[PDB]
Design a protein around this ligand. Structure first.
Ligand code: UY3
Lengths: 109, 108
């Protein structure tokens, strides 16, 4: 068996410097991390080196436009390896934070 | 900046609540889950909150902010700024749900 689209989605909150300020408990089943170990850590620390420049350009688009769709990128999984993700980013103003809807494209059982 | 994330269906029912709600509005997530956000709303602001949820689904992922009075666990009306946007996974045709950031703000 393999997980559905909703069971492969998790929410995350970030400050304007990309650091995690909140993470959905769902990330544990998908990528292995516990939300408490991600807090205060920049999301950039987890990107695959080949997705680095693309994610930088997407973050720059998210800041100028306020909303962005990342495209496919890899995130380093806790016990090694990388999962492929697709995020929808939205900046909350009145800039206060970035709300992310992260969907794991990889096959998760 | 005391804020919490919530997720709602189109009718306003809380389907997900982030644990930072205990510090913001005094309730544990289990006390909000399955209930409608309009039930904790000040009667003067309920129609504005219902109309806001109906319009956030027509706004194609854009952010809709709404100010309203929320009845905290400690029985007080707190001013809340809720920033909402619809999300729908583009690989699917699931019904679009609403994601919110709820902050206690000053009305001054
Ligand atoms: C919208 S984006 O630029 O694609 C993007 S994807 C993403 C992300 C989220 C995760 F939970 C895990 C992960 F690996 C990456 C983030 C972003 C933003 O740059 C940011 F909010 F600042 C920082 C977080």
């Amino acid at each position: 068996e393999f997980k559905g689209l909703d069971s492969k989605t998790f929410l995350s909150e970030h400050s304007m410097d990309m650091k995690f300020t909140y993470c959905d408990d769902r990330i544990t089943e998908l990528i292995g991390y516990h939300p408490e170990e991600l807090l205060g850590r920049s999301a950039y620390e987890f990107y695959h080196a080949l997705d680095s420049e693309n994610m930088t350009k997407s973050h720059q688009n998210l800041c100028t436009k306020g909303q962005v769709v990342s495209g496919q990128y890899r995130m380093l999984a806790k016990h090694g390896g990388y999962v492929w993700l697709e995020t929808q980013g939205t900046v909350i103003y009145n800039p206060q934070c970035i709300m992310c809807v992260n969907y794991v494209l990889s096959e998760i059982e | 900046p005391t804020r919490f994330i919530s997720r709602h269906n189109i009718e306003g029912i809380f389907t997900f609540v982030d644990h930072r709600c205990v510090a913001t509005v005094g309730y544990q997530p289990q006390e909000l889950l399955g209930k409608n956000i309009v039930e904790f709303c000040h009667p003067e602001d309920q129609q504005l909150l219902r109309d806001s949820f109906q319009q956030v689904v027509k706004l194609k992922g854009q952010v809709l902010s709404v100010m309203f009075r929320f009845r905290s666990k400690n029985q007080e009306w707190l001013w809340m700024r809720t920033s909402s946007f619809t999300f729908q996974n583009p690989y699917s045709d699931e019904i679009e749900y609403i994601i919110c950031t709820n902050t206690n703000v000053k009305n001054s």
